[PDB]
Design a protein around this nucleic acid. Sequence first.
DNA 1: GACTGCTTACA
DNA 2: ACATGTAAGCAGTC
Length: 571
Amino acid sequence: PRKMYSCAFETTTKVEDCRVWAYGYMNIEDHSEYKIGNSLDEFMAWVLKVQADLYFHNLKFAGAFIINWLERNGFKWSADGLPNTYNTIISRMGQWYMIDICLGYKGKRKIHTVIYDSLKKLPFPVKKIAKDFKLTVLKGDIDYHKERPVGYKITPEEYAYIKNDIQIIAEALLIQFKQGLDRMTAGSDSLKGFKDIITTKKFKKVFPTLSLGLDKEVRYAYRGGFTWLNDRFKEKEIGEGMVFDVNSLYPAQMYSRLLPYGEPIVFEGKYVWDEDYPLHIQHIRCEFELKEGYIPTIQIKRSRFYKGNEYLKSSGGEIADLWLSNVDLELMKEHYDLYNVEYISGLKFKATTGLFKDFIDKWTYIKTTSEGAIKQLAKLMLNSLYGKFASNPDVTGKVPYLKENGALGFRLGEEETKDPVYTPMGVFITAWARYTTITAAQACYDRIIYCDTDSIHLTGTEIPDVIKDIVDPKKLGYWAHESTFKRAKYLRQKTYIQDIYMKEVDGKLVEGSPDDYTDIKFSVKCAGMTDKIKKEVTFENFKVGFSRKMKPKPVQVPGGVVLVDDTFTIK
DNA sequence: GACTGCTTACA
DNA sequence: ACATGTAAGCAGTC
Ligand SMILES: Cc1cn([C@H]2C[C@H](O)[C@@H](COP(=O)(O)OP(=O)(O)OP(=O)(O)O)O2)c(=O)[nH]c1=O
Ligand SMILES: [Mg+2]
Ligand SMILES: [Mg+2]
């Protein structure tokens, strides 16, 4: 049984003096075992001899300072667990999960210290964690401005702040561990929690591990959420409207839709109805023209003919190769006229309902009876379960190295794979969800402004009679009338602003209606736009050309990472 | 360069 | 040992 420690660094913010000026560590099950000091060499000496599991909140930041030390002290990168090497799990998107430091072997025992990311377990700011877990949190923060030379001596106040930060994570992590949420990440606990319910025995019988190749071609049919701005409204200031939001859309599909299980059977040509294998994926070649009065539903990515984000009214005189679930193919056929159709091949699946019942009943209840970070964690259990099923077996990551200038560089590592989970599930969950969303959007064609995944934005303020029977503020899978706005402007996908009607309840602002409102909330939704920049946005300046030099970006410099303000522009 | 790589936000 | 797609900005790559 290895010891567990909560750790943190305070670092300088100078590009060309970049260094740790303070560290802290605290035993997660013995808060009286802790140490605060001013030296990274002193900390790393402890790291080397402690033979424990370490946690930093946001390992991506602290790990840069740690790997810079390792590379300067005779440690090189190796996955082969040799003496005086470190291993990392850094993903190809650049998520840090682990730094594993190997000092050697005494018998059949590895001598090593392992460092993990507590952000993977608790993806919130430290203060949010303290508020929502109900833990002691000190007011204010360390002065990020003060001049701190080498050997700078930590004040009593800074010492208290550092100790508070490490103790908050310690207490929160311990709360989770004692419930059995002890794995590396929140998603890992979700899949493990699901396997506990249905049994591991039943898991690999119902969700067999597919060959890497079969999983790859299943994945051809795997697509995300429907994100679409009606061109009619693009860049226009508009009046009153409303937003409908599905109550947990993906889990809702998991709960009640017919979904694939088992090994698929390959077929050639056009799928022939098989009651025992009622779901399929079909490889189709065709040209297509959107029918009059229908929303476009076809997006083709990685093509020189089409912009990947654009929903297509026409194939433009080129033959489209498409891999499609039966739910998607049926939707495509309702919205489009098809030309020169070739049914090439496909895969058909056994199917059933209700495999996720107990797991979703558990976590929807925890979500409903919880608040803040604790609610968001229950939400994450539900959503990471879907993601886990569609886990990409390509786990090739990044290998750190020390550049000639003293800064960390990264190279793509040797290709590697892990077993698939069950990707057909992912295919049909998103498929049933697109179906849910698109059919509702299509039923409100005369009023539809905008869709993103689980939501429809409409003109006017009354519920359409055609969706009245599937609207509910709480029921899983139903549409909630979430808000009503006084005015809005949608510039493009994931880029819009709204003036929302609010009313006060018990001193708390709640969504209201055009007759039952006291306050107007300005809301900004803009992919890539960080929170400080959002505060700069007005109805008047929210247009193409809006720019602020306020976006923090982490720059690798000699010694570690500095956050430097970069520009963000609506192009 | 158009591309991808390196980062965030919206789901 | 590592949940998902999608959409975006900007510094690099002839
Ligand atoms: C936020 C989020 C959403 N999604 C997908 C699945 C969700 O059903 C869908 C819409 O999610 P959201 O509307 O963002 O979140 P939610 O409905 O689960 O919870 P809430 O509305 O209370 O904030 O997008 C993920 O797969 N992972 C995520 O982390
Ligand atoms: Mg939503
Ligand atoms: Mg929602």
